[model samples]
Target chain A: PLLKFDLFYGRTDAQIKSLLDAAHGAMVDAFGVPANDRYQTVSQHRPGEMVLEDTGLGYGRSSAVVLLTVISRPRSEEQKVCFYKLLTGALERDCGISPDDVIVALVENSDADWSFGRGRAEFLTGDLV
Target chain B: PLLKFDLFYGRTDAQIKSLLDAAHGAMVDAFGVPANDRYQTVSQHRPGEMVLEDTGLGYGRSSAVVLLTVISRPRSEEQKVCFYKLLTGALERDCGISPDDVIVALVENSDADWSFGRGRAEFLTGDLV
Candidate 1:
């Protein structure tokens, strides 16, 4: 899976690293993803660059609000639920991110749709397995 | 669609801005996506942070390599092909990016899977139109 983290800019580099670690840890624990299969991109946005409304949930947010978008193979419903729980728990305990502050969107695709580079589809070519 | 751009860190702010503009322009032309519906996140990585191999295609790359991941509703195969052509043409014409250096992955999802914020699924709630 490729985890894309969108959050406000201001956190130190170490803090961002910790956030990534916690997120990857949750994925590994929930779905048994390999430890070395970490793929991620963290984008820190300025105030005006990001606009996330509350949508009438009456939940105020701090700078800790996160938008996590996961791009990967299809996962089971149970796996998705467990990942959410594990991710929110770890982020709160380790990075001070609130469960209410995090928004996750999972986008799934098949192996044939991916290419590492070189105009080649690694998954279909067995280079990824 | 949400466009996630991953590239090596070194470009000037203006260059990045131009890249985004060109990309969004291509999306609008190819997909008929609304101009105001633009959503994107750009992540700049250090040397070791990103490792994209050539997959034995024998295409050497410069710093202009880009990995574009698109998360959106399913698009027609024809639309996808047109996007690649338009995007590569524009980038090569405007930003000096090579078609060989560009890699794109499109991930499809349904509307119920998205939440703008406030713990609500805006697409299901009819809040997003």
Candidate 2:
């Protein structure tokens, strides 16, 4: 999966690294991906640049809120729920992020949609299995 | 639509701004979206952090390659193709980015998947009609 994190600027590089590691761990456990299949990106925004509110659930967020978007092959409903739980839980344990401050959305893509390098759809060409 | 740009980190802020503007213009023209309904983000990475290939199309790319991901309600095939053309064309004309270096993928989501703020799905709640 390609995990994209939308966060507000302020955390140190070490903190960001921890966050990334924790998230990746959860993805590996819940989504059943290999440890080395990490494809992630982070975009830091200024304060107020990212406005995240509780959808009337009363779970207001702090500056530590994370909006995660996952792009990958479709997963089962059970896997999806497990991923959400594991991701939020691991972040809380490893990075001190609150579950209430985490929001995730999964966007699925097919194998043909990828082209890692060398102008080749490695997945389609069976170069990667 | 929400446009996310994955780019290599060496461009000036002014150049990035121009790219964003050109992209937004293309979106407006191709998707028929309101000019004010812009939602975009840019993630600049160091060299080699982003590796995009041409999918065997024989169109080699330069450092100016742009990997654009659009997240929004589903679009028609015609709308999607139009967007691709307009986006690459505008980027070439406005930001000097090559059409051959452009890659795009659209991910569909429902209105209930959004919570712009207040933890409320604005589109679902009719707040964003």
Candidate 3:
């Protein structure tokens, strides 16, 4: 139930917040996650630190690349593609960011490892859905 | 063999470099990953953009929280604890950062999903060790 975004641009607080909002919108559009289920963390970085050397496609300095991490299980290929499209388009249209800059790598995992504090495995305990 | 670190400190290029180096050292010490096999990406964020409101433990503004995403199989609990201690101690001892600020989240995935380059799965092809 957590999403963390890593961005290379040294953006403002407002810009980061906008990106987070845009991401939530994308998730809702792509995965049908309700608003109350949303949890996001945004991080900005220097270009050197957030390296974008191997884009596999064309890119520029204003790229604003993103590396997102999700704590949920894996989805189907169609769902992931839909999510990427929605996220890229939203990042461009809503956040004024370029879609070409987006680079996503999803890591899937079992739900038993998740802990939402209190030293409990929320997902395992059915405390989280 | 891939590690991604997210920082909110908006650190200097050299400081970030030091952090990366420190992380690699810790991984080598804990996991015994070869020097040439090390892979890492880092991101720095503005003060407000990288939120740490629910730390559970007390923290200050300068507290640099790191959200690390790893692309590899899961390790034993002891391995993770060892890595964290090595990483925290090295970051503090070598980079002059506090161990209290470090936070790591590891996401494990199957080896068949890893693709280093050339549109091929290196781990599946037996190209990565």
Candidate 4:
């Protein structure tokens, strides 16, 4: 579970935490990952940066974008769609962020690529599962 | 190719441009993306914010991390490794950024997922190739 988020500068801690928490919520709802499996990074940027399109749905200054990379068992497209809806709703309701402010992409891979520590491939070693 | 980067609050223009260009260089070498077919985004950040592990490679405050997601024909794992080296060298040589500061993660999918414009997915429509 590798989640990264971008926020405007000067966003209060409460505001920032809500968005981050929303992502964590998605992980648990979509993938059944335990709440303790927190591996997320948050980034803050200046205004006028992060040039994003409306994609037909316009966004405002408080918009937040999340990019998530997951290395887990394969999931069906149905599962993915469900996750996206869950994520959008979670972000909107939990964080008070608009769906317009929401931009997301999910990338998937199997477990041959992770190494948390000990110089070992934990996923292959069954140490992670 | 999508590239997202985070830097300290006050990196100069020359400095930022160099790093971004280095990433572009990696694309050309590894996947053969044209110089003009560039699709990249950059995000700047404040100091003490982007938490990165040294991976045993000690890094300075100016460290950078780039997260890239690509939608193209699949490349072998070998190709990915080569890209890593190329990107590392490019950033170090062109941007003067240390390999320690250069953190990267690549997520991939086929053209079926991309939609550059129009209501159609360009990859599936043969509009991208």
Candidate 5:
């Protein structure tokens, strides 16, 4: 199965929001979500706003963090890699961004629990019977 | 206040999970979280598993998506930018990844509600009095 990857960077609340708004717009324009569907959700927090110290980690200075969630559809492992590559290209060419200043993570899930509304679902798992 | 940015990439479940495991370990080592603290969580889904149609967007083909979350500490706007730059650099130089294939977003929040355990928190807002 394919997996999703996430990247993180630090910035100010206003700066982060501005960049997200722009990125979301670009995603919508490039990907073209359905009329009634949403592409993504954005959230932000300060150091203490979230739980991070328990991991037994330390930093020289306080920093900003952002979280993103990505998913695979129809379960195409190749497409997953392609999408990741394309997105990375977009960020670098379109926004002049880099990776060292960011931290990234990835996750993968089965399609049984996903829904597309309109009474449609992926039906990946066999009958529960 | 500073902000957090998220970047996404496509990959296989095993690949994504492996990368996340490494990234999480790196975060813990780089930041030095407390012994009892956790840095982040990883999750993945198939296309139908997530809702992405309402954004009124379309794609040439179905693709894999990855999400990341980054947060700030003590709310320093400058540090936020620094972190973003550093993260971007790390992803590219260390991982041999490119930005052209990635999509990025950002968000920001206040520090009043952040908690660090041991009765310690960011406490940015003045007393309610």
Candidate 6:
């Protein structure tokens, strides 16, 4: 499994960004990735009316950890496994973090046509806009 | 990595159902899973106002492939890797599909606060509604 975890600790874009900046700094100091490469992107959003307050956070004062998994595709099983391991080691050793500070889950069983691109562009872009 | 792909065809819900039905049928035939167990869920949505026409499909005439990667958390690295490999083999041999048809992407840098769940419920739901 190839997975990425983002840990956030604040409310509002500014607050969240500040936390992210701190975390990103830690990641960079540990992993040596470029500053520009450590930016976060908004993957998905839900309208206030559409989301159930009981089930999830109402529009504000909430944060999330996005888990990206490649369930199927040209990527081989071994390659996928290697990817996850690499990330885990990097985060733990580099960031001095643990799992307790986060919420985790996995989504498998995906396929093509679920994406917009028709061919190679699809694979290149992966699942982010 | 936590990833889920939904393969769809056609312009309307009816048309997409026709294709999904076929694919779901194939999944059941191969995996022997219950009919209801094979249902699909919508994870995220994009408002017409925010999504760029060129980057993504203008609103209609476009579909998506979602790759959910869990970067950090309570889950062990071994569990995450196993999860991705399991999904890979299942979709390949069971669905008789190829990766070439899909667009693949991974979002690994995610965290718990990103989700609305204050605690364990976040883990239970993963990244879907």
Candidate of highest DockQ: 1
The candidate that wins on lDDT is 1
Q: State interface RMSD in Å for all models.
A: 4.9, 6.5, 6.0, 6.3, 16.6, 11.0
Give model 6's DockQ, 2 decimals: 0.06
lDDT for A31 in candidate 3 is: 72
lDDT of 4 by residue, B1-119 (tens): 66655455566788777777877888678877667767766665543344444323234424344434343456666566566667767877886666655545445667876777778
Task: Candidate 1: list runs displaced more than 4 Å.
Answer: A53-60, B1-4, B12-65, B71-103, B109-129
Q: Native-vs-model 6 lDDT?
A: 0.35
Per-residue alpha-carbon lDDT of candidate 1 for residues A1-129, written as tens digits (9 for 90 to 100): 778788888888778888888998998899785675566667778988888778899866777798998887778999999999999999999998888888889878876555555445556667766
Which has the better TM-score: candidate 1, or candidate 4?
A: 1
Report how far off residue A105 is in candidate 5 (Å): 25
Please give the CA lDDT of all the candidate structures.
0.79, 0.77, 0.67, 0.61, 0.37, 0.35
TM-score of each: 0.61, 0.61, 0.57, 0.57, 0.32, 0.30
| Candidate 1 C-alpha lDDT tens digits along B1-129 | 899899999899999998899989988998997797789898887653444445345555677788899888777766776777788778878888877777777888888878777999988888875
Residues forming the 10-long window of minimal summed lDDT in candidate 2 chain A: A113-122
lDDT of 2 by residue, A38-65 (tens): 6567778899598888879988599999
For residue B80, model 1's alpha carbon misses the true position, in angstroms, by 8.8
- Cα deviation at A123, candidate 4, in Å, is 9.2
Error of 3 at B14 (Å): 2.0
> Which stretches of model 3 miss by more than 4 angstroms?
A5-40, A43-69, A72-129, B59-63, B118-120
TM-score of candidate 1 against the unseen true structure:
0.61
lDDT of 3 at A125: 58
In candidate 6, stretches whose alpha carbon ends up further than 4 angstroms from where it belongs are: A2-43, A46-129, B1-11, B34-37, B44-99, B103-129
Segments of candidate 5 deviating more than 4 angstroms: A1-38, A41-129, B1-18, B21-38, B49-65, B73-78, B118-129
Q: Write the per-residue lDDT of candidate 2 for residues B5-54, one digit (tens) a residue.
A: 89888899999999999989988997886789789999887553443444
Worst 10-residue stretch by lDDT in candidate 6 chain B?
A: B45-54
How much is B66 displaced in model 1, in angstroms? Answer: 2.9
Taking candidate 2, what TM-score does its chain B reach relative to the real chain B? 0.93
In candidate 4, stretches whose alpha carbon ends up further than 4 angstroms from where it belongs are A6-40, A43-107, A110-129, B54-73
Sorted into a CAPRI-style docking class, model 4 comes out as incorrect
